[PDB]
Amino acid sequence: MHHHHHHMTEYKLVVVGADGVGKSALTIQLIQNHFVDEYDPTIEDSYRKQVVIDGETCLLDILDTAGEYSAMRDQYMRTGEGFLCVFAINNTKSFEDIHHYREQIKRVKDSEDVPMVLVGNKSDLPSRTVDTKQAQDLARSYGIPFIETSAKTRQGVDDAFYTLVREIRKHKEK
């Protein structure tokens, strides 16, 4: 099954992770909305972008979570078709938090096969506290990709979101 916008598939992507890791910055860097004067979003919200992925136009509807209380939290997880689980490579606790985000997603979606990408953000920093091997090991334990990103340099941001969409497509057609 799929969501739609007119005659194109709409993919419901959810960006989760501890506050401060760069969820909003990554989402902004993918939207690349250029009209707006910069505002720090600072409230949970969703954002749309039309993209052509492997020849196929689609709509991305991206929920940039704050976590805080959201009454919609379980419903967003049920709606969401794939999840970016974001930590910051200089924030060990944010990395250790990932397990709990995955536990919540599995609780709601009743699946261990939910399309997800582990995202290690802030890769532009000249020093780090979570090693690449730690992160690839965790991703391997989940059977999901690990991608290093920076919302500052924009390295890996496209790979992260488009890999997630491709994971959804693969999961949908299995």
Ligand SMILES: Nc1nc2c(ncn2[C@@H]2O[C@H](COP(=O)(O)OP(=O)(O)O)[C@@H](O)[C@H]2O)c(=O)[nH]1
């Ligand atoms: N150095 C660096 N800083 C980042 C990156 N992404 C976000 N930040 C910074 O980390 C802070 C938190 O970013 P924000 O997008 O609000 O994180 P969120 O709370 O996860 O949405 C801000 O001061 C950003 O400038 C990144 O890739 N590299």
Ligand SMILES: [Cl-]
């Ligand atoms: Cl699923």
Ligand SMILES: [Cl-]
């Ligand atoms: Cl690309």
Ligand SMILES: [Mg+2]
């Ligand atoms: Mg945010």
